[PDB]
Paper text:
To examine the structural basis for inhibition by our panel of synthetic gluco- and galacto-configured iminosugars, we determined cocrystal structures of the 3-GDIs and either HPSE or AcGH79. Crystal structures with 8 and 9 bound to AcGH79 show that both of these inhibitors are situated in the same binding pocket as that of the galacturonic-noeuromycin 4. Within the iminosugar ring, there is very little conformational change between 8 and 9, and both maintain the 4C1 ring conformation seen for 4. Furthermore, the axial 4-OH present in 8 forms the same H-bond interactions with the protein backbone (with the carbonyl of Asp105) as seen for 4; however, it also has an additional H-bond to an active site water, see Figure 4. The axial 3-OH of geminal diol inhibitors 8 and 9 is found within hydrogen bonding distance of the catalytic nucleophile in both structures. The axial 3-OH is also within 3.0 Å of the εN of His327 in both structures; however, it is unlikely that there is a genuine 3ax-HO···H-εN H-bond interaction as the 3ax-OH is oriented approximately 80° to the plane of the histidine–rather than being in line with the plane, as would be expected. Furthermore, the εN of His327 forms an H-bond, at the appropriate angle, with Glu45. The galacto-configured 3-GDI 8—the breakdown product observed in the active site of HPSE—inhibited AcGH79 (Ki = 5.8 ± 0.5 μM) more potently than did EcGusB (Ki = 137 ± 3 μM). Synthesis of 3-GDIs and their 3-hydroxy counterparts allowed us to dissect the mechanism of their inhibition both kinetically and structurally. These 3-GDIs are well accommodated within the active site pocket and form an additional H-bond interaction with the catalytic nucleophile.
Numbering used by the authors: 18 to 475
């Protein structure tokens, strides 16, 4: 029988207002070597972003940001015209790539077709300040201040050493002098250049002193997060992915304190399920839709300004897979982001679960939407327990449910939202939308194990 849980929505318990550009994706800077990829002509990839949000952020960076070399006279290799750069697996040095004005021209048209804003990595790992100044100037010239949210001066500088980019002795003090040199050079060329940093996992030895030192030089703090890894570790399972992650709660609390001490908001500029490109059997499954949807709400409730799920190529954890030549598809994780896209923006509300200790991985979020209608995003992340949710605190003549479903937690396909798969170019409409049982003040919703649901009340 289902676990019988109570959900109390409290319209007077005001949480954070979710911004309209909360959602986003992160890609490898190597992908900019292919001017066909981030292009006005990539109508397929553009459709997938527009469906994730009318407003959102495209972040370009990753380990490949230390291996990409902007040049004003560069042209793409014939290999570059066909490159699909998936997530760097973080074993060896990435391949050297060149970025061309043509690729930056085409990125502008892509941002025009998607309506999204840009976070743009610069090569602090291996490049020169003067070349970063020049690439920033061209990007400002072509993208504009309105669409360009921030430059980032290196990716995971705290990992440079492990990755062979700097010697073992490289520390925050060394990165701060590097950061200051790039910053100064870029500002000579681009006086209004916006920045974010330090573009790594929260920690005490890099992210906290970054904020204190560079607080007058940045728009916001940029953090990374992987739930799991390494992928060779048999610990890293769907079971563990469905559980609360105490490292995440701590880093989130670290970010809120930085915001208190410096006034700087925080965005999770690079995140996914499992690091080193993801884990087959975990990252590429329906479980990843429950994890991603849940994370978006959890970080929104904590006061995050937004999120950027890393992906590209056919990476195990990519929300969107494919190429201009072969087309694009929505991986399971995409469906978690689609639930958030359909909820829309508004102000988070109090939503308390009781009688739920035998279904402890059920999470719930209530939202007063910008259109005034109440919504509830539920993730039944229990792999073995069905739930029956008695919903109080909502007075409404009628609620509907869109279900986030696959026949098994580990399915790599068979993922639907609202009784429908995503189609070509991000096309989606609900084909199954049932009413929630009960009346004003007492709704009852069933959810099978390992399912999700979005409730919308009139
Ligand atoms: O999957 C991973 O480990 C990522 C970690 N951050 C940098 C990168 O995005 O390039 C990836 O290597």
């Amino acid at each position: 029988s289902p676990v019988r849980v109570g959900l109390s929505v409290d319209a007077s318990a005001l949480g954070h207002t979710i911004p309209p550009d909360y959602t986003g994706l992160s890609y490898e800077q190597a992908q900019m070597a292919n001017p066909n990829y981030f292009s006005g002509a990539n109508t397929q990839l553009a459709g997938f972003l527009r469906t994730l949000g009318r407003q959102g952020v495209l972040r370009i960076g990753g380990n490949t940001s230390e291996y990409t070399f902007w040049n004003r006279h560069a042209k793409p290799t014939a290999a570059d015209e066909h490159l699909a750069a998936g997530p760097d697996k973080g074993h060896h040095a990435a391949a050297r790539e060149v970025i061309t004005p043509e690729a930056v021209n085409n990125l502008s048209e892509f941002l025009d077709k998607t309506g999204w804003k840009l976070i743009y990595g610069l090569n602090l790992g291996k490049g020169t300040p003067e070349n970063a100044a020049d690439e920033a100037a061209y990007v400002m010239e072509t993208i504009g201040a309105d669409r360009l949210l921030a430059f980032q001066l290196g990716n995971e500088p705290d990992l440079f050493y492990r990755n062979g980019i700097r010697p073992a002795s490289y520390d925050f003090a060394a990165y701060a002098g590097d950061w200051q040199r790039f910053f100064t050079a870029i500002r000579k060329r681009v006086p209004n250049a916006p920045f974010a940093g330090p573009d790594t996992a929260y920690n005490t030895k890099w992210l906290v002193p970054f904020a204190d030192k560079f607080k007058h030089d940045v728009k916001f703090i940029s953090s990374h997060y992987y739930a799991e890894g390494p992928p060779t570790d048999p610990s890293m399972t769907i079971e563990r992915l469905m559980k609360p992650n105490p490292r995440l709660l701590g880093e989130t609390a670290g970010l809120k304190q930085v915001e208190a001490d410096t006034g700087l908001p925080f965005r999770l500029t690079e995140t996914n399920s499992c690091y080193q490109g993801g884990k087959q059997g975990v990252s590429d499954t329906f479980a990843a839709a429950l994890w991603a949807g849940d994370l978006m709400y959890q970080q929104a409730a904590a006061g995050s300004t937004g999120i950027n799920f890393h992906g590209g190529g056919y990476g195990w954890y990519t929300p969107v897979a494919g190429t201009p030549e072969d087309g694009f598809i929505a991986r399971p994780e995409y469906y978690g982001m689609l639930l958030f896209a359909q909820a829309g923006a508004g102000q988070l509300l109090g939503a308390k679960l009781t009688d739920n200790s035998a279904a402890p991985l059920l999470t719930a979020y209530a939202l007063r939407g910008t259109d005034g209608r109440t919504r509830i995003a539920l993730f039944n992340k229990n792999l073995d327990a069905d739930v029956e949710v008695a919903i109080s605190g909502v007075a409404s003549p009628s609620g509907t449910v869109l279900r986030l479903e696959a026949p098994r937690a580990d399915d790599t396909t068979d993922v639907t939202f609202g009784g429908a798969p995503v189609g070509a170019s991000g096309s989606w409409s609900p084909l199954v939308q049932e009413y929630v049982p009960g009346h004003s003040g007492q709704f009852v919703l069933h959810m099978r194990k390992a399912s999700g649901a979005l409730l919308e009340f009139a």
